[PDB]
Amino acid sequence: SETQYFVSHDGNRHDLFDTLEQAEHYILKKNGWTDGEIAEKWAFVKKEARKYGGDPFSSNGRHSLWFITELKLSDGVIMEVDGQLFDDYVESISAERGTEEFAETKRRLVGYYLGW
Ligand SMILES: [N+]
Ligand SMILES: [N+]
Ligand SMILES: [N+]
Ligand SMILES: [N+]
Ligand SMILES: [N+]
Ligand SMILES: [N+]
Ligand SMILES: [N+]
Ligand SMILES: [N+]
Ligand SMILES: [N+]
Ligand SMILES: [N+]
Ligand SMILES: [N+]
Ligand SMILES: [N+]
Ligand SMILES: [N+]
Numbered sequence: 001s002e003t004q005y006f007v008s009h010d011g012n013r014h015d016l017f018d019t020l021e022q023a024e025h026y027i028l029k030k031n032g033w034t035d036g037e038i039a040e041k042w043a044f045v046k047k048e049a050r051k052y053g054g055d056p057f058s059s060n061g062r063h064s065l066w067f068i069t070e071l072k073l074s075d076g077v078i079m080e081v082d083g084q085l086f087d088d089y090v091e092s093i094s095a096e097r098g099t100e101e102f103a104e105t106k107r108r109l110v111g112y113y114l115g116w
Contacts, residue, residue, distance in 0.1 A: 005070055006070075006113055013112060014026070023068045030066075093105065
């Protein structure tokens with residue numbers, strides 16, 4: 001069992017990273033942070049954004065469209081999306097298992113997350 005961090009921007013897939021810090025670092029570099037700025041300011045910006053409902057990845061004072069999703073996998077199978085059992089997640093945005101709607105929704109998400 002292994003956790004990976006999936007970075008997306010405005011619906012577009014970027015990468016799967018092994019740790020949260022790697023995923024965060026990638027977004028910050030994408031947003032033009034210097035390596036100096038990250039080491040001196042990121043921990044503070046992330047906690048203050050946490051504390052007051054803001055987007056720590058905001059480049060202009062508004063939601064950045066960046067997201068980090070936490071995937072748990074076993075043998076390359078997605079088991080959980082942000083702590084929620086995958087099939088439960090698919091059901092909540094579509095229909096229940098057994099329906100073609102469920103099968104197509106999970107199929108697209110599987111390919112989306114794994115970069116097919
Ligand atoms: N994508
Ligand atoms: N990139
Ligand atoms: N990387
Ligand atoms: N990193
Ligand atoms: N780093
Ligand atoms: N990008
Ligand atoms: N700390
Ligand atoms: N600070
Ligand atoms: N503060
Ligand atoms: N914030
Ligand atoms: N946050
Ligand atoms: N699963
Ligand atoms: N089923």
